[PDB]
């Protein structure tokens, strides 16, 4: 079952890396930043797959596709993983 984890970026962004999109295999949390919005939410961990950002689907998304979406997701980023 997926989660609706709402974040807010700081001078560190959302606080997590991503990998995948490199072939339609999807995007996965690659690492959590200590102190970051991700970390503090304790609702996302290394390994989680990003299904969508602010209602926008990222299952088939490419890397840069997820990268950019996340990047301009606003200040109130609604993540589904």
Partner 1 sequence: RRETQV
Minimum Å distance from CB 3 to partner 1? 17
Minimum Å distance from CB 1 to partner 1? 23
Q: Which stretches of the chain bind partner 1, using CB under 8 A? A: 13-14, 16-19, 21-22, 30-31, 33, 63, 66-67, 70-71
Nearest to 17 by CA among 66, 74, 57, 54: 66
Nearest to 2 by CA among 50, 37, 53, 56: 50
Query: Which residue, 1 or 55, is less far from partner 1 as judged by CB?
Result: 55
Nearest to 23 by CA among 64, 59, 56, 62: 62
Query: Which residue, 60 or 67, is less far from partner 1 as judged by CB?
Result: 67
């Amino acid at each position: 079952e997926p989660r609706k984890v709402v974040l807010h970026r700081g001078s560190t962004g959302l606080g997590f890396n991503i990998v995948g999109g490199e072939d339609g295999e999807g995007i996965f949390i690659s690492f959590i930043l200590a102190g970051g919005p991700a970390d503090l939410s304790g609702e996302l961990r290394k390994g989680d797959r990003i299904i969508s950002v602010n209602s926008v689907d990222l299952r088939a998304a490419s890397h840069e596709q997820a990268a950019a979406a996340l990047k301009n997701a606003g200040q109130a980023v609604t993540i589904v993983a």
